[PDB]
């Protein structure tokens, strides 16, 4: 998504050529240093065996001409805060007694209180010398990166959950629609703009003509410019890169204005997921241990759905026997599976293909070989010829499906640059519209991840007294101990933003709303709001806005001041005995879809030097049965299953076809032999001039 690309930039990796390696890197470089404040994010960081070695540059950080990282600070002079922004590197910061951003200012430029919080040279945050502090933070969120600056209520999340939310915002797949969050931050718009995946007008002008493929704009002085959208393009990771205009045919647009939103953008601001009506109760053990149960509305209305484009490449080359041809004359294969293939081979555009279908019909020469007597007799009986050319056609790999967007054909005969010794290279793009299904991974912005355990029908879904079913149900057992209460805060605020509010300022402003910014005292229903990272909606303000939640359609407040709604059971029909925390949570669909995770094998390719079939879903891979698993089997006392696994399932090349025959013919599975890897080991040892011999007795 645009955020993933933006954060791949602004990434500082402490490893590479001439840098620390994960193994040689100690444990003191991975930690957070006081000098990181404002120069490198302490939160955003990989959670695997790379924590600390890779970080993200903070929002305001800048790079010194010498390579050091500078950070801005407001020069405060004689206790008087100023606007002069000096960019200090870590060294200069240590020599200055730098204050903190949220230090109240008397509006005269001077601190309205003694005892202003400060940092000092040794990185120690401690008591403060009032007055005569030389510098002050430019603004809050100076220490967070762009990804971490998009987590509302970050200050209410533990560093672990904030880290996971930051690392998981970058995994959200681009949905078909994309909705700007009800609760967001100020970083959404800037992140989308600067990511570069959203079209921005270069110069002011009036939109002359807008269509779904390009926008022609007439500038203020004669000249006109045409921006061409990138429709249904494939990204490096297989997602969709669709761009659609967001401007009419007469609008005047100024320079730098967004005029066509990108993959994960809504009206120019980043949109990684969808706002879903959420209940925070435990429900029948289906949302057990960070599992999620979704309404079927989310599959019917198609709100969590992603277009995935997969490219398959095949190149006809020059071989000893001759050259490979791409045509619809594949040997021995019928006229049914040669149906969609065009007159020239490669399949047609828009032809639905399921796993195993033929995409590109290729035929490589075989060279004379020795047909068995049985096959020669059969060919004579059925009157055929060897054809002397084998098939190496490209086929939809196992488990895949989809339409066929477009074919890109490069050819030497048409003088297109191709590697040496290849005549043609054809790429077919196959697009599938994935719908959310159990096994797919979802998450909010607060590290509240989880796979989908079940997708309930809308009718057996808890519904508010109004009758609106809830879309998602998270578990209450995951909030208190993971220390990411921020999500709950978000939920409440989301609901308020969805409903709209009116603070009753009949007799002045309520004491809890005195410091609220003007014009927030009244918000129309479905009003997008922002809570910046470390200055946001305080809990008292949230309580107040939750109290005044102007009614949905009749006079009926579905959520009391406590934030909990009385839900009706979808199946039983009785109301649940106690209210349930209901709101609107902005949840993303992570790119860990079960369709790419499922894999199975009964027999397939075997490795070259050893058997023990190839590993990997990309091949037809067997699941590694390591030493820990073998110890577990030994502890169970199950000797026969372990021998079976390590001999005939994996390595023994004679008992393998024998077990296949026994299974297919109903006979007993045969006795296992010597694994091939042991004889490989014996030969390796002997070739080391070590006389190893297996004495009979």
């Amino acid at each position: 998504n645009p955020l993933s690309g933006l954060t791949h930039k602004r990434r500082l990796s402490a490893l590479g050529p001439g840098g620390l390696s994960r193994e040689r890197a100690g444990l003191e470089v991975r930690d957070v240093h006081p000098s990181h404040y404002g120069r490198m994010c302490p939160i955003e960081t990989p959670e695997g065996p790379n924590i600390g070695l890779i970080g993200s540059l903070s929002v305001y950080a800048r790079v010194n001409p010498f390579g050091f990282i500078e950070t801005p600070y407001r020069k405060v002079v004689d206790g008087v805060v100023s606007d002069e922004i000096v960019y200090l590197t870590a060294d200069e910061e240590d020599r200055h007694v730098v204050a903190q951003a949220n230090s109240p200012i008397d509006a005269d430029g001077r601190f309205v209180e003694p005892r202003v919080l400060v940092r000092r040279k040794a990185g120690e945050v401690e008591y403060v010398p009032s007055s005569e502090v030389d510098y002050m933070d430019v603004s809050p969120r100076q220490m967070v990166s762009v990804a971490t600056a998009m987590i509302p209520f970050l200050e209410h999340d533990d560093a672990n959950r904030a880290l996971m939310g930051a690392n998981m915002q970058r995994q959200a797949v681009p949905l078909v629609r994309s909705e700007a969050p009800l609760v967001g931050t100020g970083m959404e718009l800037r992140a989308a703009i600067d990511a570069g995946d959203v079209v921005v007008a270069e110069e002011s002008g009036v939109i002359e003509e807008v269509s779904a493929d390009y926008i022609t704009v007439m500038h203020d002085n004669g000249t006109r410019r045409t921006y061409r959208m990138r429709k249904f393009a494939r990204s490096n990771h297989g997602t969709c890169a669709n761009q659609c205009p967001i401007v009419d045919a007469g609008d005047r647009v100024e320079a730098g204005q967004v005029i066509a939103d990108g993959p994960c953008t809504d009206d120019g601001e980043m949109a990684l997921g969808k706002n879903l009506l959420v209940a925070i109760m435990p429900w029948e053990g289906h949302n057990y241990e960070d599992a999620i149960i979704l309404s079927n509305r989310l599959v019917e209305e198609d709100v969590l759905t992603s277009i995935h484009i997969e490219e398959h490449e095949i190149d006809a080359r020059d071989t000893k026997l001759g050259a490979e041809e791409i045509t619809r004359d594949i040997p021995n294969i019928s006229d049914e599976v040669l149906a969609d293939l065009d007159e020239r081979g490669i399949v047609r555009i828009g032809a639905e293909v399921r796993d195993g279908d033929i995409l590109v019909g290729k035929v490589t020469p075989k060279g004379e070989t020795e047909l068995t007597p049985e096959e020669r007799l059969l060919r004579a009986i059925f009157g055929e010829k060897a054809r002397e050319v084998r098939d190496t056609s490209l086929k939809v790999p196992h488990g895949e499906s989809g339409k066929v967007i477009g074919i890109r054909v490069f050819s030497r005969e048409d003088e297109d640059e191709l590697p040496a010794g290849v005549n043609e290279l054809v790429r077919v793009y196959v697009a599938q519209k994935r719908k959310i299904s159990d096994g797919d991974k979802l998450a909010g912005r607060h590290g509240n991840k989880g796979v989908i355990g079940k997708i309930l029908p809308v009718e057996d879904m808890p519904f508010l007294a109004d009758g609106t079913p809830v879309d998602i149900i998270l578990n209450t057992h995951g909030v208190p101990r993971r220390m990411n209460i921020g999500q709950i805060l978000e939920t409440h605020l989301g609901w308020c933003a969805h409903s709209g509010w009116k603070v009753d300022a009949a007799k002045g402003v309520p004491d809890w709303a005195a410091r609220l910014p003007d014009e927030l005292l009244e918000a129309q229903p479905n009003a997008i709001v922002s809570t910046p990272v470390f200055d946001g909606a305080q809990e008292a303000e949230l309580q107040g806005l939750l109290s005044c939640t102007l009614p949905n359609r009749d006079g009926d407040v579905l959520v009391d001041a406590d934030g909990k709604a009385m839900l009706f059971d979808g199946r039983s029909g009785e109301p649940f005995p106690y209210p349930v925390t209901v709101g609107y949570m902005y949840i993303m669909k992570l790119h860990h879809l079960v369709d790419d995770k499922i894999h199975a094998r009964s027999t397939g390719p075997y490795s070259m030097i050893t058997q023990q079939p190839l590993g990997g879903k990309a091949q037809f891979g067997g699941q590694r049965f390591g030493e820990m698993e073998c110890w577990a089997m030994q502890a169970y006392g199950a000797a026969y299953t372990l021998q079976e696994l390590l001999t005939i399932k994996s390595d023994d090349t004679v008992g393998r076809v024998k077990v296949y025959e026994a299974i297919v013919k109903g006979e007993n599975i045969p006795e296992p032999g010597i694994p091939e890897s042991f004889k490989v080991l014996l030969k390796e040892l002997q070739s080391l001039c070590l006389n190893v011999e297996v004495l009979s007795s």
Partner: peptide
């Protein structure tokens, strides 16, 4: 700041001196 943007109202109580770079 950006010419045409959604009007996302903020709960922010602190003005920012420096625009994001």
């Amino acid at each position: 700041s950006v010419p045409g943007a959604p009007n996302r109202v903020s709960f922010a109580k602190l003005r920012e001196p420096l625009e994001v770079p």
